[PDB]
Amino acid sequence: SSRHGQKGVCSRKWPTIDMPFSETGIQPDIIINPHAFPSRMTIGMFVESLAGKAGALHGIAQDSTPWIFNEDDTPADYFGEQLAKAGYNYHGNEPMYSGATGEELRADIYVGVVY
Amino acid sequence: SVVGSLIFCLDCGDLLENPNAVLGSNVECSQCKAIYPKSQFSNLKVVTTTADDAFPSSLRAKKSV
Amino acid sequence: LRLTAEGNKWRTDILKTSVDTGREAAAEVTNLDKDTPADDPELLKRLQEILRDNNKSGILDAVTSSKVNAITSQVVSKCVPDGTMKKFPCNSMQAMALSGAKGSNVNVSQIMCLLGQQALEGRRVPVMVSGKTLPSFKPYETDAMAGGYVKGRFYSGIKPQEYYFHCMAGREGLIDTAVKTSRSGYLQRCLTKQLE
Amino acid sequence: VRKLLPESWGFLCPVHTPDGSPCGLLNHFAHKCRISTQQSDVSRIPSILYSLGVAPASHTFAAGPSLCCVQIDGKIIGWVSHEQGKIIADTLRYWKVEGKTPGLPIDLEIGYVPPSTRGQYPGLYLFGGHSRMLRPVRYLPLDKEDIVGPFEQVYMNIAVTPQEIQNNVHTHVEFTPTNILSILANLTPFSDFNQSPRNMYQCQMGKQTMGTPGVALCHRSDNKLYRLQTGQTPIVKANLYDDYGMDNFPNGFNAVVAVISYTGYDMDDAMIINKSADERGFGYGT
Amino acid sequence: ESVQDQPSVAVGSFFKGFRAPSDTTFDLYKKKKSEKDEFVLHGENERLEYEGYTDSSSQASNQYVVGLFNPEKKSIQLYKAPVLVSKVVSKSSKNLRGPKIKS
Amino acid sequence: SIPDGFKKCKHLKNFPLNGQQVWLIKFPSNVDISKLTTMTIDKHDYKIMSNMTLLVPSESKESLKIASTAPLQFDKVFSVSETAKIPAIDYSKVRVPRKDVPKVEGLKLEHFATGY
Amino acid sequence: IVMTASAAIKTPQMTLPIWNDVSDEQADTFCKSISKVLLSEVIDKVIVTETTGARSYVIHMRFFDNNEYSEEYDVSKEELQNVISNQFIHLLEAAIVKEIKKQKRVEANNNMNKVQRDRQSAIISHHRFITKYNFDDESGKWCEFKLELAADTEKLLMVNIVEEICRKSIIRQIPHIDRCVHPEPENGKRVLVTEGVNFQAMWDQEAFIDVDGITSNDVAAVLKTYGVEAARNTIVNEIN
Amino acid sequence: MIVPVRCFSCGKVVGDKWESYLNLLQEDELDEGTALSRLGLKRYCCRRMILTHVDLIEKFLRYNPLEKR
Amino acid sequence: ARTADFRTLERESRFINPPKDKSAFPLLQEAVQPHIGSFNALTEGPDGGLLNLGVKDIGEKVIFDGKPSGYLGNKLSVSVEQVSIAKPMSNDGVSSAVERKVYPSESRQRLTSYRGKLLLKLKWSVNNGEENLFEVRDCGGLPVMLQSNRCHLNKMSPYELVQHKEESDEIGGYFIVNGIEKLIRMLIVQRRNHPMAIIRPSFANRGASYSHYGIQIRSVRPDQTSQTNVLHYLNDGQVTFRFSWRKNEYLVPVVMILKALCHTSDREIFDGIIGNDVKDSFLTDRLELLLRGFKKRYPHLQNRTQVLQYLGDKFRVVFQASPDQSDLEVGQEVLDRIVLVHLGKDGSQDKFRMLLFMIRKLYSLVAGECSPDNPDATQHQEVLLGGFLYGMILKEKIDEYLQNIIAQVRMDINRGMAINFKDKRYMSRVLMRVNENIGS
DNA sequence: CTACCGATAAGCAGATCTCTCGATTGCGTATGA
RNA sequence: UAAAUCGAGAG
Numbered sequence A: 001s002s003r004h005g006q007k008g009v010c011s012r013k014w015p016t017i018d019m020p021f022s023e024t025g026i027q028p029d030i031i032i033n034p035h036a037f038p039s040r041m042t043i044g045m046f047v048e049s050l051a052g053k054a055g056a057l058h059g060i061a062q063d064s065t066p067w068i069f070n071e072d073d074t075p076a077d078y079f080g081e082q083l084a085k086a087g088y089n090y091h092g093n094e095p096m097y098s099g100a101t102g103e104e105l106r107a108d109i110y111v112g113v114v115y
Numbered sequence B: 001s002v003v004g005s006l007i008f009c010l011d012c013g014d015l016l017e018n019p020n021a022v023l024g025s026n027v028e029c030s031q032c033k034a035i036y037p038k039s040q041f042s043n044l045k046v047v048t049t050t051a052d053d054a055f056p057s058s059l060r061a062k063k064s065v
Numbered sequence C: 001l002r003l004t005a006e007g008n009k010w011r012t013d014i015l016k017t018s019v020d021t022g023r024e025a026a027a028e029v030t031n032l033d034k035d036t037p038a039d040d041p042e043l044l045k046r047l048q049e050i051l052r053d054n055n056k057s058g059i060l061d062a063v064t065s066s067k068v069n070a071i072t073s074q075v076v077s078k079c080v081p082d083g084t085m086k087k088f089p090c091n092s093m094q095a096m097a098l099s100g101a102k103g104s105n106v107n108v109s110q111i112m113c114l115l116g117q118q119a120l121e122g123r124r125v126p127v128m129v130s131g132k133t134l135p136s137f138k139p140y141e142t143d144a145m146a147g148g149y150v151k152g153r154f155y156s157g158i159k160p161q162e163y164y165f166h167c168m169a170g171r172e173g174l175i176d177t178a179v180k181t182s183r184s185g186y187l188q189r190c191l192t193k194q195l196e
Numbered sequence D: 001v002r003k004l005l006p007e008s009w010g011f012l013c014p015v016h017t018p019d020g021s022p023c024g025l026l027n028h029f030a031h032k033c034r035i036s037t038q039q040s041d042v043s044r045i046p047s048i049l050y051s052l053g054v055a056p057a058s059h060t061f062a063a064g065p066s067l068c069c070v071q072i073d074g075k076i077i078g079w080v081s082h083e084q085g086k087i088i089a090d091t092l093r094y095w096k097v098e099g100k101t102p103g104l105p106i107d108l109e110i111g112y113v114p115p116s117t118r119g120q121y122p123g124l125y126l127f128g129g130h131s132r133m134l135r136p137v138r139y140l141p142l143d144k145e146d147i148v149g150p151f152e153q154v155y156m157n158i159a160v161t162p163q164e165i166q167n168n169v170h171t172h173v174e175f176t177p178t179n180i181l182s183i184l185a186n187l188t189p190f191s192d193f194n195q196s197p198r199n200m201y202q203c204q205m206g207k208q209t210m211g212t213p214g215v216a217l218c219h220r221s222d223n224k225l226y227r228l229q230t231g232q233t234p235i236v237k238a239n240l241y242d243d244y245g246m247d248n249f250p251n252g253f254n255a256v257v258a259v260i261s262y263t264g265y266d267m268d269d270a271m272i273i274n275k276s277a278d279e280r281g282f283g284y285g286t
Numbered sequence E: 001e002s003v004q005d006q007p008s009v010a011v012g013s014f015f016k017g018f019r020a021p022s023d024t025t026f027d028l029y030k031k032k033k034s035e036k037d038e039f040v041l042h043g044e045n046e047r048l049e050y051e052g053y054t055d056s057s058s059q060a061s062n063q064y065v066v067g068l069f070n071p072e073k074k075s076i077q078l079y080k081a082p083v084l085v086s087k088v089v090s091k092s093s094k095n096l097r098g099p100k101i102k103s
Numbered sequence F: 001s002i003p004d005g006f007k008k009c010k011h012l013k014n015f016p017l018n019g020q021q022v023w024l025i026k027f028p029s030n031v032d033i034s035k036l037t038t039m040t041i042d043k044h045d046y047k048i049m050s051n052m053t054l055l056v057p058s059e060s061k062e063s064l065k066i067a068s069t070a071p072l073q074f075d076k077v078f079s080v081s082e083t084a085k086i087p088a089i090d091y092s093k094v095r096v097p098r099k100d101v102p103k104v105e106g107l108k109l110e111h112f113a114t115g116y
Numbered sequence G: 001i002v003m004t005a006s007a008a009i010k011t012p013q014m015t016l017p018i019w020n021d022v023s024d025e026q027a028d029t030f031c032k033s034i035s036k037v038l039l040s041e042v043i044d045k046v047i048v049t050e051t052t053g054a055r056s057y058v059i060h061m062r063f064f065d066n067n068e069y070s071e072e073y074d075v076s077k078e079e080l081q082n083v084i085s086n087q088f089i090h091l092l093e094a095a096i097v098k099e100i101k102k103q104k105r106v107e108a109n110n111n112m113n114k115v116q117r118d119r120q121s122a123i124i125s126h127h128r129f130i131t132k133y134n135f136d137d138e139s140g141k142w143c144e145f146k147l148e149l150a151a152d153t154e155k156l157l158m159v160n161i162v163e164e165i166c167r168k169s170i171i172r173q174i175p176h177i178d179r180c181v182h183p184e185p186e187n188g189k190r191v192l193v194t195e196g197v198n199f200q201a202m203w204d205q206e207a208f209i210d211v212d213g214i215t216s217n218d219v220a221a222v223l224k225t226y227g228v229e230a231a232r233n234t235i236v237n238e239i240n
Numbered sequence H: 001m002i003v004p005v006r007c008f009s010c011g012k013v014v015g016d017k018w019e020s021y022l023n024l025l026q027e028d029e030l031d032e033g034t035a036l037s038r039l040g041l042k043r044y045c046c047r048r049m050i051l052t053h054v055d056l057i058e059k060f061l062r063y064n065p066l067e068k069r
Numbered sequence I: 001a002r003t004a005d006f007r008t009l010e011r012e013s014r015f016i017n018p019p020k021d022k023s024a025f026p027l028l029q030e031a032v033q034p035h036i037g038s039f040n041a042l043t044e045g046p047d048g049g050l051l052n053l054g055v056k057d058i059g060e061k062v063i064f065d066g067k068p069s070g071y072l073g074n075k076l077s078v079s080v081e082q083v084s085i086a087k088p089m090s091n092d093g094v095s096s097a098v099e100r101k102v103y104p105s106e107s108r109q110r111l112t113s114y115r116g117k118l119l120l121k122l123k124w125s126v127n128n129g130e131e132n133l134f135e136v137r138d139c140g141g142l143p144v145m146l147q148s149n150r151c152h153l154n155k156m157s158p159y160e161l162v163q164h165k166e167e168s169d170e171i172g173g174y175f176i177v178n179g180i181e182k183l184i185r186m187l188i189v190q191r192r193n194h195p196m197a198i199i200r201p202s203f204a205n206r207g208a209s210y211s212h213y214g215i216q217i218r219s220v221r222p223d224q225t226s227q228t229n230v231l232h233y234l235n236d237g238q239v240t241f242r243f244s245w246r247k248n249e250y251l252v253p254v255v256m257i258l259k260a261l262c263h264t265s266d267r268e269i270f271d272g273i274i275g276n277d278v279k280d281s282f283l284t285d286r287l288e289l290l291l292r293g294f295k296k297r298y299p300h301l302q303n304r305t306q307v308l309q310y311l312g313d314k315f316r317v318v319f320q321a322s323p324d325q326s327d328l329e330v331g332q333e334v335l336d337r338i339v340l341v342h343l344g345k346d347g348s349q350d351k352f353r354m355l356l357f358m359i360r361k362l363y364s365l366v367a368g369e370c371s372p373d374n375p376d377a378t379q380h381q382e383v384l385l386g387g388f389l390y391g392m393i394l395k396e397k398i399d400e401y402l403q404n405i406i407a408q409v410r411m412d413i414n415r416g417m418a419i420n421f422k423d424k425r426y427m428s429r430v431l432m433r434v435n436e437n438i439g440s
Numbered sequence J: 001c002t003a004c005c006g007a008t009a010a011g012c013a014g015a016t017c018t019c020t021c022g023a024t025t026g027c028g029t030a031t032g033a
Numbered sequence K: 001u002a003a004a005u006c007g008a009g010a011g
């Protein structure tokens, strides 16, 4: 589970070769199905993904106490600035290639690091 | 000594019995046994009105807000 | 989850009209004429009596809930279909909402545009004995925001009072889940025993 | 009785409560809430009270909601008018919050209930006994830290952030809105961007995380212990994660997540663990 | 214009509308105290036991001032009035009692 | 009933109640009567604006009674209330505007293409 | 519906179809006339004056204004006088004597005419210890009646008991009917719905109700007054 | 506890870099990001562990049952 | 300007060596402040602590022998004067000599409790001041909580804490019993010393008193023990005091207690209940009904001593009233032990004023001028610390111990024995016969 | 006048899906040593 | 290997 009440049982141990790999060679270690979010509305996990990506890239730690951001300091924009400066996608997406077909997927995949 | 249907002793403060519950012509205090004539108090009138939360009616709701 | 600059401008412009919704609803409920400033002593006394009794409080809560629900429906209709930075079918959230794969339109609107008005059991948020729905609010407040109606969205966060109200609604749901899980076995068993 | 009343703002954490039968019953304290376990010296408080314009209870001829009754730990002290009682309550709060009178302690909770129409019973109730509930808030004048309790709070105006302070309305202000939440509820990152049931689930699940219970496990004989072999501090964490020294007991790990419907084996809530990461030590425990 | 440390007036509190015959009289009982002295009143009557008391919890922290004032002259004469919580008892019923342990 | 360590009264002072209205003032213990509404006495400031019966020494100056006229109650009862100078609120000092989240400075490009 | 087969359901009501020639008017007045009105719903307040000069009891119940209450509840002043005289005084008398036994263990009141004096004397004869009586038949605004009581009995509230009697008295109520609210038509169905089940009440009023379509929320009453098959139909309807 | 040897995601050996990272932090005024860049960790997959390792082994070692306290 | 820092170097230094003076995290040990504070307040602090206050308020128990004073003679006055708890030592068998210190490390390893022996001193007085025979008994090992005043880890810095094999930053406020850690869970109850209006149908529904109104209070003794005083309402115009001494509940008219508790006339009641509100017909009528009802029901209770005598006569077996104490003394005892305990004994006038205010509040509530106070809202609640529960249980157990002593003496009298009250051999025989394992 | 028949009011009787772990088990007493 | 009660609970 993450830190947003997202349970999950490991359905299968996906071999690393069949695992989708990214442009940089990073194969993620955990897949979470995107269909969970529209009903759960845990946007905190989405924000935490790119915040952690920026933190791991820049070797820093970002505080996540509630009620630091507001309507005019959206955390998505704030961490997207850092991601763009680091050189990744401003929206947190990341080009990815299927591990079986080897071809680039239709759209850039949302990838990050979460606790 | 008197406020409503109450008669209070002016010496000690005990509650004298009702003038309709005594033999007559005087009332004796139950503590200091002082003499109070049956006169000096004859109309123990009280006025009581029911609360506004006693008769909930649709018309009353039209008299509010 | 994002929105275009024009879409955010529309949403903010419509939300700016929700400032006086609570005061207008209160003025209508208290049978007072409009234009009444929010600090009128007669309005305060009438709100006090409405809080004291249990039926006028329900009536006022229903009226204010209807008004703020009209406002949030306006925001939803104006923003959700043609206000997003990414459009269908590129918008994956909109795709899963439309295709019924998971979630729904109210979920997407809560995420992106507005979290709406909180309702625990067909009514607005409970009030203190003094007429304050929360320590942060003036006694006998006339405001949609200080009534459980939250203007935040799950993409851009919610202020602490709105967070409190949302937690309250979640608690109501959590209790009702247990009750609904508990409330069927005897009926099922007796019917099948009779009709076996 | 399980519903979340607003009177518990700042004392009982709204987020923290276990889902299930005890939902709303077995709640938790706010992380900044302290219970006064020792009786403050209320001996000299009456002496100040009579000096402030309070007629003594010995010779008063006063009762009912028509006059303000001044109590002290459940004893009648005097009888004062209503607006007067409000003035005395405000002056007592000011004197307590400032450090000048040795009599009034900071922990003395002063709950003044003003007159109303069929409201709560008016009075002026002072408390200094044990078992009280105390929360630190910032008194707007003198900018000094104050202490308030549940009884006194529900009749007070406490802005949640300094920007919301209104003129002639707000008298106090919370130090930070983050102190109305318990621990394991302040450790959830970006809690304002989540649905409340999910916050409750996360709180209930943090207590079930498989992590390091202690470090003295070679000097114990507990029947069952769960230990996470390789724990890491979160890259993203609240300011209170290291304020309580939680890094001494790491709970999980930083995993490269990917929000992508690719494998087909994870649809409802399940998830896929990379095999290579798994047998390289990801999540191992004993 | 003057303050009288020596007692010169007393005020009691029995109840509203208290009245007694002119023959009724009271006495005083003063402690050998230095500050915040307590005054005790003892009354005499044909059929009622008048007694008085003072509570040390309140009388020590406040002081009462009794004085006259000319309608057109600002001259006043302050005085020390001890306030008393005073009750009235019946002599006959005061000593009334009963058997200690019933059978 | 008389307790131990308790003395009695020996004499009193003639109170000229006739000479005229009897007043009552509830002064605090901190205030001392010397050179006597927002009147100021000593170094503090105060606000000042038949509940109890009245007694007086008799002719012999060794007995009490109820003062009256051919009972009697005090015309004006004053309760001296101590007050403090309660300060105003410096809104310009307490209501500070919000600050943006502090962006980390010196953020240099880190992502590089493979083999570069 | 299924488990208990309760014949005393919490909210029994029935559906009353209306003829297509009955508009909102001449139907709202029928609803008001058929609705139950209690004695408490027309009394503004009561001013109980007690004297012990033999314990007298002067009860003066201020009434709602005629023009509004007679239009709202379709109740006439003559009807009010009749119901109070026949029910209120008797019920108050019974309550007072029960309480005593348990304890043991405006103007124009001088110009009353011959009819008023005869009514007062008759009511005194009918009742136990009522001494005076008057009713403002001119406007239906007030009604006073002294309640001379024995001096031996101790003091009584004469407020709580009057309250309870006014609450439990009945002005004009057909049995097992509380109110007849006319809801909005569902789809061209001009329907009146009551608050209690009693089929025989509206069987007389053929003019306003088409008795051929009286369906009720009850099941036991339907079984007892319409046979088994109507009960089966209403069971299916109320479970659907 | 002790620093992981290989990288969970990719597989790069980061077990030899913990001591070097600590030395670069202590004896030199090198920020975490610059020290990780100098160490040779470019991807965030490799960076995150050496950046967020906790080293509980040292706290565990203070309780030795084989030596006098 | 980093928003947050990993503090890698500082954390690694702390793991290198623990702090030598104070714990690094002030807020980690402030979370367990309730339990530690309560436990260290039940032993240390003012007046010798809550334990000393409780054993002082417990009082004495009396029994009699076969020597024909006017009574049975040989007036035994057994009571516990002081209670002292010491940090746990180990006997190491029968070696004795110096007493080694025991630690939670070997307590947990032993799979046994972490208990320190408890010392109790009795005052065995005969004939009320003739023969005092003090003799201090150890009634077992009372379990003590960690990091408290009576624990060996009381003020040790983290360096010595890790030196004693305990933990790096142990803050435990739990108890160790049978090698299993246990914690006295917190509890939330009614706010102390506050009469709050209560509306509850369960009063009238299966309650002898007939109404759903009332004024409930939960007064706590200075030793932290509570006794509810529910002020019910009766529909006919009177109110009835209620309280529970044993597992059964008692009802008394309010005027009887109001008179017996402090001398007063029936006029002062009217003046106090009705403060200048003499035009309030509802209050005047209800007060008339109450006063006349009391006068009718009890016409022979014309004096304060007489109502006290009636109360003492009524409450004789329930309060274990020995023949030595008179009826007036028993009435004063039950009054001071039941009504408004939080105002303390010798506070009769204060209790009178409090009960009068309670009556006025009840009448105002039933008149609709006030609103019922929610017993579930935090506005009218407080929390029991758990350590105060420990003090309550200890006071009750000491009371039970004195009860067992008196019962053993009574059984000895019932059987045919020497029954001498100045014999130390008989002292040992009667004391050793009873089961006195308070620690168990 | 007095026996038979119902009509309340109080009491009596009974109701409000599977599985896994852990923990626990009484005082009183009375005679043979 | 029992049997009952309490706590943690999972769906």
Ligand SMILES: Nc1ncnc2c1ncn2[C@@H]1O[C@H](COP(=O)(O)CP(=O)(O)OP(=O)(O)O)[C@@H](O)[C@H]1O
Pocket (backbone or CB within 6 Å): A039, A040, C100, C101, C102, C103, C104
């Ligand atoms: N095919 C589907 N499978 C699952 N959920 C679907 C769905 N189609 C729609 N939904 C939506 O999923 C949401 C919850 O559906 P439910 O049947 O209650 C499963 P749940 O486990 O109770 O959700 P939870 O994660 O909030 O606990 C609804 O909004 C529903 O519209």
Ligand SMILES: [Zn+2]
Pocket (backbone or CB within 6 Å): B009, B010, B011, B012, B013, B014, B029, B030, B031, B032, B033, B034
């Ligand atoms: Zn008398």
Ligand SMILES: [Zn+2]
Pocket (backbone or CB within 6 Å): H007, H008, H009, H010, H011, H012, H043, H045, H046
């Ligand atoms: Zn790697």
